[PDB]
A and B are shown apart, each in its own frame.
Chain A
Amino acid sequence: NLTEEQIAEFKEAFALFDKDNNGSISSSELATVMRSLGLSPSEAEVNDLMNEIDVDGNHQIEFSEFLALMSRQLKSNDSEQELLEAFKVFDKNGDGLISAAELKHVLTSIGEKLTDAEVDDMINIQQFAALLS
């Protein structure tokens, strides 16, 4: 139950890591895929995932199951903290403040561009991330 941009990334990553294109991926590549999706699990969670996937004795993950795993893994993240680390990329001197003019440039120029109006309902990092969530 995520955004369309996230689902699209999930579908292409699944497709890319489906080497022989039979519609399922080996659990052996689950670690690399999750890494590419910016939500690599802990060495404990991945073991719990390998054991959780080994219950039925099928180590081929089809997209329905794959989406379920990514969904709860992504939800097993601190949204406030992830956003914090994001702003922390545009603070190079390390003082805890990012430029305002810079944030407006990147979010409308690169990535999944936001439109000027949507960024204008959106500087102090620790605080900004704190109150946006």
Chain B
Amino acid sequence: VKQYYFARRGETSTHDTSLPPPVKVLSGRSIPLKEIPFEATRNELVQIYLTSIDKLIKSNKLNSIPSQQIASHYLFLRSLANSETDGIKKNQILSLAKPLGTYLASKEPHVWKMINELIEKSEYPIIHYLKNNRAHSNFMLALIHEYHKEPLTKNQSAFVQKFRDSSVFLFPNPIYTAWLAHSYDEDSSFNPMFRERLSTNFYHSTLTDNLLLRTEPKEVTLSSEHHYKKEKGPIDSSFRYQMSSDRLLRIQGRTLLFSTPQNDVVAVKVQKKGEPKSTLEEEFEMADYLLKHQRRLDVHSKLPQPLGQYSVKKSEILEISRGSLDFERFKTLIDDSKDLEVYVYKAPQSYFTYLHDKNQDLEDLTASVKTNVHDLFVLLREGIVFPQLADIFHTHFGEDEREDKGRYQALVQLLNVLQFQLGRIDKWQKAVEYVNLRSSGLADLGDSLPITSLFTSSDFTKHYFSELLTGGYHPTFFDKSSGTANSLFTGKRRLFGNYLYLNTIAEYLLVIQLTLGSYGDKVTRDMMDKPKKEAVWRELANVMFTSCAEAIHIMTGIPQSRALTLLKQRANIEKHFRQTQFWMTPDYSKLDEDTLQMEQYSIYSGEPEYEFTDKLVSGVGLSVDGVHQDLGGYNRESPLRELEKLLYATVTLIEGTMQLDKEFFKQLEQVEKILSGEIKTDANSCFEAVAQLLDLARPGCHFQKRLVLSYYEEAKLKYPSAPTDAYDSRFQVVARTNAAITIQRFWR
């Protein structure tokens, strides 16, 4: 059977089509919203940096700045030059750098030795020099503030305010994307966090935003045979299902569950109060589509078998259900009319077991989670989004008048202005109480959305993400000379589909996380074996991290095991286990001040403790309604800080790999045109282009480096007189590793 997707991903010129106008209305006054251009503003700042380097050299003050900052300047200028095609600009950059180099080899020659070690390893050596906490020293901004003796423009000031945390945010596209990718490698100690006058700054979400603002608007095209495209005529439900009260097992929601001789289940889904017929026909057609294409897509879920869709007299439904003890609540859900549409289907018993069910042992939970994670993301690749797996809300206080409608935003910092942390989750266990992830796999398949609805001003996106589609307003954005409110955020109108694509990924994994935590609390609540409680929470952390790596694998092709190693460079599974166990169980409500602090120190290690003024509710913990536990205090952030780092690391690895691959193939096409003759130039330029392709390969991906080595061998044959001393070291490393592989694999 041929396995492939009915969905295709490319790029388009803009997402800013049929959007709400970029206007904020404040007290009857309409304020126009303007974009601050990312790339143009970034480039202006790098130019100012270069003129500041010029002044630093003329001033002969080089004696006065630490060697590490001189090295950073030098290595960045060398990386910048190598990325600059224009030979005049390139030599302009190399001239600004020579005085620094001359200085280092004389007065700081051991640092100079290290510099050349990196230069002999990479064409963007600055990225390997900043694989650590040197990335938090903003040498570029410090130089601009010391030598640029005039105000920055409003655009520039707005840029540096958002991207103050690190010089890397000023790097040109290929150098930033390559730095971001390799910052996850196994020799990297880079963590997007440093300490600030006792205060700790976390800027993991800033990495993702600096990346996304560089990307092209994406486009998804669905095949003609796709569920949301192909015209499948009306359903032919010639077959009816005879309900017997004697076969009724129980009621869940509006769905009557009947037994069969085969010990699976026949289910009758009955129209809700205000549910149209389409919602029922849609679930029928989606189930049929997924059964038909189950092998093509390799869907692991045990899919329900659709049987019919027809009308039934209320009176008949009421006569057969009237025995069950759920009768009264069922009557309250079904439509008041006397002629009710229904959807009949057959499914195994495990389809009605919610994935958080505490009667599953950890081994069955793990397998069922894997099936759900698998299908969620293969179906995302197929172009199908499930925006109602669960009911996660940040708040209910201002629900109707909130732009977000209270719906939780898994990457809120990217989808709103001046939101720095994931917020309180309201009644977090209740959000997944009826989750559409089951022991068997996915369920409730009719509540679906074509992926293309995330890239347009659909009803869904207009309802929940109006701010992102409209633009950014904040009093500090107001330019009184123009009467407009300017921001980098308003630039996202053009790219908002890229943002919601990643938010969907993080949202799925947040649903998984809450489902795991609901399982964890319920199975450990009555456990008297205390070390065993911790072991369960430890393993649930492993399952979450594994789920994130599986999503990466499914979306990028990165091997699952490397994806896990990449995630663990950035997210600390021990902190995650301690934080989830601590805040997702009620035990902490029994603690007093001194004990809470000590416990918090253990789960955050060095980081700041979770601060709150809320009055804890006995036996629950943080709870606005006094009954159901929340994750976070009122008007405060979620305490699951490592979870936030993990979700951002996952989507940053997915998106960063996607963009790294794009840079890799752009440079590859360039290398192949130089080797073929389409682009005729000298041998060093050819060697340089090939060495740069090496820098754009996925961290840990050997076959990519094997390919680059093959281009380098071909390049040496094309320029047989050319000296190659400046590049053999790095490619000999690849050659010896490659040779090692072949030997190792033959023995297997």
Residue contact B702 to A9, C-beta cutoff 8 Å: yes
Residue contact B745 to A21, C-beta cutoff 8 Å: no
Nearest CB in chain A to that of B701: its residue: A12
A5 to B6, CA, bound (A): 29
Residue contact B743 to A86, C-beta cutoff 8 Å: yes
Residue contact B5 to A19, C-beta cutoff 8 Å: no
B-side interface mostly: helix
Residue contact B2 to A86, C-beta cutoff 8 Å: no
Nearest CB in chain B to that of A103: its residue: B743
Contact of B747 among A6, A64, A114 (CB under 8 A): A114
Nearest CB in chain A to that of B733: its residue: A110
Residue contact A5 to B5, C-beta cutoff 8 Å: no
Q: A53 at interface (Cβ–Cβ under 8 A)?
A: no
Q: A130 at interface (Cβ–Cβ under 8 A)?
A: no
A40 to B703, CA, bound (A): 12
A108 to B628, CA, bound (A): 54
Stretch at the interface among B432-440, B457-465, B552-560: B552-560
Residue contact B4 to A23, C-beta cutoff 8 Å: yes
Q: B710 at interface (Cβ–Cβ under 8 A)?
A: yes
Contact of B703 among A38, A86, A112, A118 (CB under 8 A): A38
Residue contact A20 to B739, C-beta cutoff 8 Å: no
Closest CB of chain B to A16's CB: distance in Å? 6
Contact of A112 among B556, B558, B706, B745 (CB under 8 A): B745
Taking CB atoms, residues of chain A closer than 8 Å to B318 are none
Closest CB of chain B to A28's CB: distance in Å? 12
Q: Please, what's the 1-or-0 string for A26-39, where 1 marks a CB less than 8 Å from any CB in chain B?
A: 00000010011110
Contact-size category for B: 35 or more
Residue contact B735 to A132, C-beta cutoff 8 Å: no
Q: B481 at interface (Cβ–Cβ under 8 A)?
A: no
Closest CB of chain A to B27's CB: distance in Å? 47
Taking CB atoms, residues of chain A closer than 8 Å to B4 are 22-24, 60, 62-63
Residue contact B3 to A5, C-beta cutoff 8 Å: no
CB within 8 Å for A111 and B741 given contacts A16-B661, A21-B8: yes
Q: B748 at interface (Cβ–Cβ under 8 A)?
A: yes
How many chain A residues touch the partner (CB < 8 A)?
48
Residue contact A64 to B3, C-beta cutoff 8 Å: yes
Contact of A19 among B6, B665, B698 (CB under 8 A): B665
A12 to B661, CA, bound (A): 12
Q: A69 at interface (Cβ–Cβ under 8 A)?
A: no
Taking CB atoms, residues of chain B closer than 8 Å to A6 are 745
- Count chain B CB atoms within 10 A of each CB in A6, A60, A107 and give the residue with the most: A107
Residue contact A38 to B738, C-beta cutoff 8 Å: yes
Contact of A20 among B3, B10, B710 (CB under 8 A): B10
Residue contact B704 to A111, C-beta cutoff 8 Å: no
A40 to B557, CA, bound (A): 22
Residue contact A22 to B5, C-beta cutoff 8 Å: yes
A65 to B1, CA, bound (A): 10
Q: Please, what's the 1-or-0 string for B1-36, where 1 marks a CB less than 8 Å from any CB in chain A?
A: 111111111100000000000000000000000000
Q: Please, what's the 1-or-0 string for A99-133, where 1 marks a CB less than 8 Å from any CB in chain B?
A: 00000001100111110001000100000000011
Contact of B743 among A9, A62, A83 (CB under 8 A): A83
CB within 8 Å for A15 and B556 given contacts A21-B5, A22-B4, A89-B736: yes
Residue contact A111 to B557, C-beta cutoff 8 Å: no
A115 to B8, CA, bound (A): 43
Q: A75 at interface (Cβ–Cβ under 8 A)?
A: no
Residue contact B740 to A106, C-beta cutoff 8 Å: yes
Closest CB of chain B to A47's CB: distance in Å? 19
CB within 8 Å for A16 and B746 given contacts A62-B4, A64-B3, A110-B736: no
Taking CB atoms, residues of chain B closer than 8 Å to A32 are 707
CB within 8 Å for A118 and B747 given contacts A36-B707, A62-B4, A82-B742: yes
Contact of A3 among B698, B701, B748 (CB under 8 A): B748
Closest CB of chain A to B5's CB: distance in Å? 5
Residue contact B740 to A110, C-beta cutoff 8 Å: yes
Residue contact A36 to B706, C-beta cutoff 8 Å: yes
- Count chain B CB atoms within 10 A of each CB in A9, A13, A86 and give the residue with the most: A86
A79 to B748, CA, bound (A): 12
Nearest CB in chain B to that of A118: its residue: B747
Residue contact B703 to A36, C-beta cutoff 8 Å: yes
Nearest CB in chain A to that of B557: its residue: A15
Nearest CB in chain B to that of A111: its residue: B740
CB within 8 Å for A87 and B703 given contacts A16-B557, A19-B665, A112-B744: no
A-side interface mostly: helix
Residue contact A89 to B739, C-beta cutoff 8 Å: yes
A40 to B710, CA, bound (A): 11
Residue contact B557 to A89, C-beta cutoff 8 Å: no
Residue contact B3 to A23, C-beta cutoff 8 Å: yes
- Count chain B CB atoms within 10 A of each CB in A21, A63, A106, A107 and give the residue with the most: A21
Closest CB of chain A to B163's CB: distance in Å? 30
Closest CB of chain A to B299's CB: distance in Å? 14
Q: B576 at interface (Cβ–Cβ under 8 A)?
A: no
Taking CB atoms, residues of chain B closer than 8 Å to A35 are 707, 710
Contact of A38 among B736, B742, B747 (CB under 8 A): B742
A6 to B748, CA, bound (A): 10
A13 to B557, CA, bound (A): 8
Q: B381 at interface (Cβ–Cβ under 8 A)?
A: yes
Q: B737 at interface (Cβ–Cβ under 8 A)?
A: yes
Taking CB atoms, residues of chain A closer than 8 Å to B2 are 62, 64-65
CB within 8 Å for A87 and B739 given contacts A15-B557, A112-B744: yes
- Which B residues, 700 to 728, have Cβ-Cβ distances below 8 Å to chain A? 701-704, 706-707, 710
Taking CB atoms, residues of chain B closer than 8 Å to A133 are 746
A18 to B7, CA, bound (A): 12
Closest CB of chain A to B449's CB: distance in Å? 19
Closest CB of chain A to B710's CB: distance in Å? 6
Taking CB atoms, residues of chain B closer than 8 Å to A112 are 740-741, 744-745
Q: A8 at interface (Cβ–Cβ under 8 A)?
A: yes
Closest CB of chain B to A41's CB: distance in Å? 14
Residue contact B704 to A16, C-beta cutoff 8 Å: yes
Taking CB atoms, residues of chain A closer than 8 Å to B556 are 15
Taking CB atoms, residues of chain A closer than 8 Å to B738 are 38, 89, 111
Closest CB of chain B to A79's CB: distance in Å? 6
A14 to B704, CA, bound (A): 12
Taking CB atoms, residues of chain A closer than 8 Å to B735 are 89
Q: Please, what's the 1-or-0 string for A73-86, where 1 marks a CB less than 8 Å from any CB in chain B?
A: 00000010011011
Taking CB atoms, residues of chain B closer than 8 Å to A83 are 742-743, 746
Nearest CB in chain B to that of A38: its residue: B706
Closest CB of chain A to B657's CB: distance in Å? 10
Residue contact B736 to A107, C-beta cutoff 8 Å: no
Nearest CB in chain B to that of A122: its residue: B747
Taking CB atoms, residues of chain A closer than 8 Å to B736 are 89-90, 106, 110
Told that A9-B703, A107-B744 touch, could you supply 5 new A-B pairs with CB distance under 8 A?
A: A3-B748, A62-B4, A85-B739, A111-B741, A112-B745
What are 30 sample pairs from A and B whose C-beta atoms fall under 8 A apart?
Answer: A3-B745, A5-B744, A11-B557, A12-B557, A12-B558, A16-B698, A20-B9, A21-B381, A22-B6, A23-B4, A35-B707, A36-B707, A63-B3, A63-B4, A65-B2, A82-B742, A85-B742, A86-B739, A87-B743, A89-B738, A106-B736, A106-B737, A106-B739, A107-B743, A110-B740, A112-B744, A113-B744, A114-B747, A118-B747, A133-B746
- Which residues on A are within 8 Å of B, measured CB to CB? 3, 5-6, 8-9, 11-16, 18-24, 32, 35-38, 40, 60, 62-65, 79, 82-83, 85-87, 89-90, 106-107, 110-114, 118, 122, 132-133
- Which residues on B are within 8 Å of A, measured CB to CB? 1-10, 381, 556-559, 661, 665, 698, 701-704, 706-707, 710, 735-748
Among all A-B residue pairs, the 5 with the closest Cβ atoms: A15-B557, A23-B4, A111-B740, A36-B707, A89-B739
